[model samples]
Target chain A: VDYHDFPSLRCELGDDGVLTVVLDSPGLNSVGPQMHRDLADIWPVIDRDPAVRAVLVRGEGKAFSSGGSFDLIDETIGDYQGRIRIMREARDLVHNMINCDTPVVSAIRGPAVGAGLVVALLADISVAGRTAKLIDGHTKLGVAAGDHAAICWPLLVGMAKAKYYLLTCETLLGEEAERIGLVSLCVDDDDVLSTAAGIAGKLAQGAQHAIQWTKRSLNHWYRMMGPTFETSVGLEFLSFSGPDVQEGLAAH
Target chain B: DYHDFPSLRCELGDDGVLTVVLDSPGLNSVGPQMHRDLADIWPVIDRDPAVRAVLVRGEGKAFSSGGSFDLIDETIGDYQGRIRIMREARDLVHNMINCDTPVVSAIRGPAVGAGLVVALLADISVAGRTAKLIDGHTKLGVAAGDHAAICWPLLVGMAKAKYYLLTCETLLGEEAERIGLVSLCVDDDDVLSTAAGIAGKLAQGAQHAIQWTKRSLNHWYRMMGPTFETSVGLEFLSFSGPDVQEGLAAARF
Candidate 1:
């Protein structure tokens, strides 16, 4: 139907049907409550779009996304349905990305964290700028490394680094991220978008079914991780109901 | 208690370390019999409470060159034979994952195909700077079934895993270590001692804690049972096809 209907996301279709979905939200593309809903909903729309062969996701402005806004975080703290809603959307966002037949690439730069980090790490191919900053803030928020951590971090960086970073909540530069296999490639900041677009175009123009099927089959790895992701997400949301979250929220 | 398994050597020390050496002549090429031994020996190690950890290495320079061409031809011709071999391959991966004893591997030169699995799937893998790691599955005209899809993505990210497995890229041990594909890459001289020293430290740790943490972490791997089975199936299916014959002909056993 209409690709432009999404708020917080600007999905544009190329002549060859490669969709570039740009994150253009408030707070330097930081995902708040509404952006979370949009990201959670957009993948299903992409999956249904017959013209979309692949997707290239990148953020608008100087940052990919700085994560959840403080306003939404405060509202989510003591609220019952709000936390549930956020968790539900977060879970769906991951599954939708995994199951979508169109291979996705995330071109990241600037500060990437929280929901943006989820999309960045989950894309079939994730590329980062050399100066891009990446962090997983769940542990810092007094929660388990939810979102993409259990599903992909240990898989990407191994347990030693995964535990070390997730437990301590440190930030990683794109250089180390690429070296450690967290992201696919690291280039100059100016080259991040073009590099990702190039790869996306190749994937879009290649044997579509072969690439899609290969991706579909390979994603069984993530699909098999469904249970583990659920536990991490559950632990994260459970923290929202505890005193630790308040302190965690206040500490920020 | 300990018996000979063809193409390999097995020994247990008084200090609870079990060492299994891939000892076949000519770069430790694993044939069907040796493959089965590697598969079968897991249960023995699992059964023995004395084994705090295991160290797997090649008897000589190369760790293993992977399955032989003759074995490939035989499996291709005999459906039942291929199925059995497939089962052994599957067991080698799962049993290694399920075993209670922490497994450590010291790898040097030319770990390709099936050999790369043991080198990588071990809880801690130590590699020589010169160790050559290749999946060689797609190059062999098959789906990257033999533990490549199952473990590569777990060790490295899906992006690098697919890149390497699809292109059959040969990653040197240092590159593999930098990418988190292997636990450590040492000087060629230090591979065994490095692995052994880590094992000694692991051997002295609280047994249940070390073993349990391994199991817990490996739950990430164990959770991928279906994906691995799918890879194994796709790999086995490739053996029945004709492209593999050409691949076997072009490549050394």
Candidate 2:
């Protein structure tokens, strides 16, 4: 019903009050500076929209998000200025999710890795198609399990489960994800959109203040982990400036 | 040196600290009453002028004793009671986190299920060389995704956390303490005394400063509710299924 222009993301509002956000970055939706800024900038508008109650984020095709582009990673490793800017964006992405009043439900179909996976897991209710391939490649990339792994993964799956996946860099199917309590639900790839829509519709129609307050209160737990998370992200960025990440990047 | 209480059966030293032993003769080393008693009575010792700190330990051959498998089964069978007791256990663990006095755990032998797992993850932990630590929820047909998930990776790195949690393998005390999994590791004979010494030192310090510091630091644990509550709620939900039944049946053999 309402229209706003964002360069890296396609935004549309449904009659049912569900806002759909498509990561539309031309190729594999590799996250870039522009996209990160767009995501950070759009939150205030989303929070203020009375007509919208929930969000469903998905990618346009083939992949959910290919992760930060190789160029971005290289700059982060090789150039201090580039790395600083990206680190700030990474922090923004996390803070934007936490500060947004609306509940987010992510729909995953293909590869959900890197910055994209950060949003995917940070969603209040994360839904995945059975084929969704989720990975936290920070360790594989010669860094600590940064991004949202320290803050989010342990909370979802527990320390044991978090370590198992983050350390081993194992890929999990959507069904296995649901079984482990990683995702809220798993559906067929074809149904991922509809499933997210259905949930979003329920959320949009439900008591607005209760849902918002509950989300805020519940998210307090994640908020309290600020020290651990802040430390982890800082350490991750520091690792990016180290030698191991160079090897990891080359290996990958 | 503190006076030795033979019934609780731990050696007490000159400092105002007491060693409360969990020696139930055979397995079932820790039960609801014992856990409740240990939790309830520790505060009083904390208040006592003679008792500086409390060191929780298991005596006899087994450590931890065991969790209330029978109680868990009963609770699972009764929906209302199950919810109530689960909430109580959850509260008990949280209370341990919130308690003003510092608590030290000395573990030896097998520390399995909820009781042992709790001790393993306590604020300060020491274990004997032979002590076995496990979060046996998964093998028992539940999620290995409870409090362990919230704290373990933060204490140890993710890699080690995954290895022990997924496999449900036991970690020896020296290995555990060495990995920063536990606070300290001592010879089997020294576990209790060492814990007692640490508790005594804590007891003698500025109580308010120590307690408040513990409280502030625990905010880290408190902040993880979204992830922790979701995992715990889901784990409980899984307990109602057949997998847990199969786990219990298998464990019997």
Q: For all the predictions, what are the DockQ values?
A: 0.09, 0.02
lDDT of 2 by residue, A158-252 (tens): 43345435543557777877866679999989998888888988998889999999999988878867666766677677767666676677765
* Candidate 2 TM-score, true structure as reference: 0.55
Return the DockQ of model 1.
Answer: 0.09
- The candidate scoring highest on TM-score is 1
Candidate 1: where is the Cα deviation over 4 Å? B1-218, B221-253
After superposing candidate 2 on the true structure, give the runs of residues whose Cα lies further than 4 Å from its correct spot. Answer: A1-5, B1-253
Instruction: List, residue by residue over A1-252, the lDDT tens digit for candidate 1.
Output: 686667667888898678998888788788888788888889888888888988999899768988888877876676888888988888998888888989999999898998889899899999899989998876566655567677777767775456435544557899988877688889989988889999999898999889989999998878888887876777666666665566677887
Model 2: fraction of native contacts:
0.01
DockQ leader = 1
Q: Rate the local accuracy (lDDT) of all candidates.
A: 0.80, 0.70
Going through the candidates in the order shown, the clash numbers are 0, 9
Tens-place lDDT per residue, model 1, B115-160, is 9888888878888889999888878888888787667766777788
Question: Chain A alone, model 1, TM-score?
Answer: 0.96
